[PDB]
Amino acid sequence: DQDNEIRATDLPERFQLRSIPVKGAEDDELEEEADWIYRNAFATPTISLQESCKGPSTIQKIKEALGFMRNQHFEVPFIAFYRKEYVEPELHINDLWRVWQWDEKWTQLRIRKENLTRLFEKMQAYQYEQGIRALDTTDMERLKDVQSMDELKDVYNHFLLYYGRDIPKMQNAAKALKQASRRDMYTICQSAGLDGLAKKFGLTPEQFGENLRDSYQRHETEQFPAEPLELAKDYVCSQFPTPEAVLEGARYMVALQIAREPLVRQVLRQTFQERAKLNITPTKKGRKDVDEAHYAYSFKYLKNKPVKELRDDQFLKICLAEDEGLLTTDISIDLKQTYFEEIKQFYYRDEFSHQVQEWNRQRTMAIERALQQFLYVQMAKELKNKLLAEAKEYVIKACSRKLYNWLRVAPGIRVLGIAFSHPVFCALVNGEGEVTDFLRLPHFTEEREKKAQDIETLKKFLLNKKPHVVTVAGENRDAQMLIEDVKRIVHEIGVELVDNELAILYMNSKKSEAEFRDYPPVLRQAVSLARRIQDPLIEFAQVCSSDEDILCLKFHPLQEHVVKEELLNALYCEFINRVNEVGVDVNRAIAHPYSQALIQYVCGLGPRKGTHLLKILKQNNTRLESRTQLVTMCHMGPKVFMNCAGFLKIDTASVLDGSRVHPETYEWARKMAVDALPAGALEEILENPERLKDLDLDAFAEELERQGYGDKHITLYDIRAELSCRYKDLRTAYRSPNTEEIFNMLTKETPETFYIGKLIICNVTGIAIGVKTRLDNGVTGFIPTKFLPEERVKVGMTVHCRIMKIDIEKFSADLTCR
Amino acid sequence: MFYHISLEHEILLHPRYFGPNLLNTVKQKLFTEVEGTCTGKYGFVIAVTTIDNIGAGVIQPGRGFVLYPVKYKAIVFRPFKGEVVDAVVTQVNKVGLFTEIGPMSCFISRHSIPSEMEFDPNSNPPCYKTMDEDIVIQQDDEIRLKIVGTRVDKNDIFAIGSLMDDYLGLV
Amino acid sequence: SQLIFPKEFETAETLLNSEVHMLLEHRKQQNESAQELSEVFMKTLNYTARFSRFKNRETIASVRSLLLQKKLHKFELACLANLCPETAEESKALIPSLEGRFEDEELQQILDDIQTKR
């Protein structure tokens, strides 16, 4: 359906995927995002702790990056690999990606600022025809200078305060379904004409609002020449005949404009952004549920928690605690001398006359009602929400990094997989990605002869078809035996160890199994594993072609609480970072169903465009090794073309198309073939390590200053860096995962359970002499012979107490049991 | 809406609780087994106000349990069809609004509302909204609305709602 | 609604959202002064504490007495007290069983009494 419309229109697919279409950026607006995005994405220091793996020049760098893609429709990887000279070295691709959603954040705020100006001007057109507030140009300006969605909201509530009753008249203006009642007693007291004496207090709230950011009484409190209770007797009425009720209703009157002055919001926002202490108490249910078995123990006795003291994902765990009555938390600028003492004096008069003092007494606890009932309420949850997103984002930042490393493994090579599970399964893959063979081989273990006949099957497979690297599937001390099973076999070229949770989901996935459902299910895990060590990216694409597959993985224990839709694309985009880093070729896509899922990570392309190009490719039945055959046969648009064609790699077996050099920059690649002295010079520079030493790359920049495409010095060097090793995959070479990884892939040891003093269940292994104990994961070390004797250890059953020492290779389960 | 009806229950008491505090045990078992049940006959029982009387406890032949008929005055909420009630919205969606009227959730259709309330995408509060931003329904707002129908799922009775009358907006 | 959909709810007293609220909070101060409460109870208590347009018991008693003085149907005493329309018309403008029953000159009076007792 809609992919045909996607196929009809000619643009990069991810721009077409965005909920708001990309518009052309005039240079003022082009600049307007760049300062705003940089302030709100990189120049903002997070209140919670932040770390990962720059300067004011980025303001320009983002700005040129913005209009180069907003106006010209260039996706992030196209900039991040070909036009990075507009941004290097200030930003990385994931930061170049991080700019891109802030473009989406800017688009709403600009749209919404337009939307509110429509209301204000219409009410500006509605107010003048009719002490009510006037729609100032400052009111317009406060709408004009909006630099955050929070800043938008405060004006809107502030607008809705004095003019919420305009809405039936605005509906009448819309008529040129009617609005009923609101909630605040304001509405009755507004109709009661209390605003006259609300005007008669010490200050306008905005006049009071300026006194906040000054930290002094800039505008002095206007003492009306009466004691406050006399203005009651003017119009105590049918609403509040009590002189205290109008006087208290005045306080409810005036506190809410104090609550809804936008200038009050930012200063309360600013003060709370650093000066705020968090106090946490468990509930009555939380009396039982707070313990070291829960994660809420560290939060139990923590009083006046600084907002900066909040760790990287600490607050998310705090957020889970209020969900089921585990912990009740409160936040305050004050300590467990208040903030109000400064606030009270900033709206005050120092005259000791009871007229002024009762006016101050009217002023003092009125603004207190503003402080407690509203500002300690409404800005608190907005403070919570800002810390909610930061705590949520760190996990996704970590999980993006976790998936970043899993795509960082470098890949011709013949690989066998051993599938531990007693069904022990084994299978090979060819040098061209096809499964070669497979054999059911049930291994277990007194008597050892049933294992014995199958040991020589392994070296038979060495001499049947000679392999390079054979792999095992790390489980609870099952592949530890198997890494010793193959180690003797190879001794007659090596054996490697890798985990198989991605292989379990490869078994679990229906469509993954659907090619070879007759092939054994548990044996299908090594099919991925052998192809994983062959290449991780094609492996992840095959297992995780569907969206919730990545959800089925566990990058983090708390990965279910982050927002999925912004979680998924964050993981999904780092695929696109790596896929176009190496490239893709449509010949391996049409040949291998193994490599059929790599086409939708192409810059400018995706699933919707790439699938309809796949079927046309099968109709034409000639795949596109020729990058110009994309231009001719496929009749595909230049906006799609000049982005993606450089990222489509081509195997040379069928010469600059077999390079990471775009067709738009083959012309400068023709200038470097002359430096050898049309395909004779093309082979000579691409085969020799000696044409690059004398390659006059800076000389090509000399005419680049004349033409107007200059500063391509690294880019021309990138063409030289490409030709040194043909399609060199810059992913890190595969490394045997260390003991910490081994202990966390075999026993799947959580580093949280490395905590000393933690109850670890441990059934005794027995007398070999100290008694060794075994945990459910299978760790087995002897309890040290010093402490332990019936009442120090009960011989025959499990031991569970404070742990003492754990060994990363010897699986040491040490427990005092006393 | 919220009602005060006297109604019935049948408490099966095990012979464990046959000591000095069996009538107390019948009271606590009525509280435990009645307060919170989603009956279709009487909608939602919220709290048992008082015990009218504890009846004669017939010993069940061959089972040992004693059956007590308990009459109790209880607070009962029941969402009648064709009524106007104030809900609290908890989720926005294209297919409609998920509100929470208290003990129950509620679905409101996109075509059952007036055609001035349109979806607001890529906004940190997601909501339905008017083009002039006359009324915005973000999280935790009060919405008058007319529920049009009531159907029984026997576990949690939800009501479908609409907004085709005056004042059926934010308060 | 205007007519009855079931066949048994005529002989049952009707409560506001504040009579429910004041009775439910009595249960808690009975209970944690002496087991955990059910989730539907806590949810309904939070909902009816949110929409509690009478925060004092004597306001509830006065409103119930005056609604009985109006001599309207026993569902319609609690249908409108916990509802608070600012428009006496809103009353007829809504509940399809209250227009024509009474004339307009009492409606804004009972509405302003209700919002005064709020």
Protein model, in words:
Chain B: Keywords: DNA-directed RNA polymerase, Nucleus, Transcription. Chain B: DNA-dependent RNA polymerase which catalyzes the transcription of DNA into RNA using the four ribonucleoside triphosphates as substrates. Chain B: One of its GO terms (biological process) is DNA-templated transcription initiation. The structure is cut from a larger assembly and holds chains A (818 residues), B (171 residues) and C (118 residues). Chain A has 818 residues and is mainly alpha-helical. Helices cover 50% and strands 6% of the residues of chain A. In chain A, a hairpin with a 5-residue loop joins strand 5 (425-429) and strand 6. In chain A, helix 19 crosses helix 28 (564-582). Chain B is 8% helix and 46% strand. In chain B, the strands form three sheets. Chain B has a five-stranded mixed β-barrel. In chain B, strands 1, 2, 3 and 4 form a four-stranded antiparallel beta sheet that branches. The two termini of chain B are 19 Å apart. Chain C is mainly α and 118 residues long. Chain C has one domain. Chain C contains six helices and one strand. Chain C has helices spanning 19-31, 39-50, 57-70, 74-81, 88-92, 107-117; one strand at residues 13-14. In chain C, helix 1 (19-31) crosses helix 2. Classes of the chains: A mainly alpha (818), B mainly beta (171), C mainly alpha (118). Chains in contact: A-B, A-C, B-C. Strand 1 (2-13) of chain B pairs antiparallel with strand 1 of chain C.
The number of domains of chain C is 1
Tell me the structural class of chain A.
mainly alpha
In N-to-C order, the SSE pattern of chain C is EHHHHHH
Overall body shape of chain C:
globular
Mind telling me the C-alpha Rg of chain A? 35 Å
Total count of helical runs of at least 4 residues of chain C: 6
Q: Assembly state here?
A: part of a larger assembly
Name the helicity range of chain C: 40-55%
Largest interface: B-C, 32 and 35 residues
Main sheet overview of chain C:
none
| Count, helices of chain A | 37
Mind telling me the C-alpha Rg of chain C?
16 Å
Shape designation of chain A: globular
In total, the number of strands of chain A is 11
First CA to last CA of chain A: what distance? Answer: 69 Å
Q: How much helix, percentage-wise, in residues of chain A?
A: 40-55%
The first-to-last residue Cα distance of chain C is: 26 Å
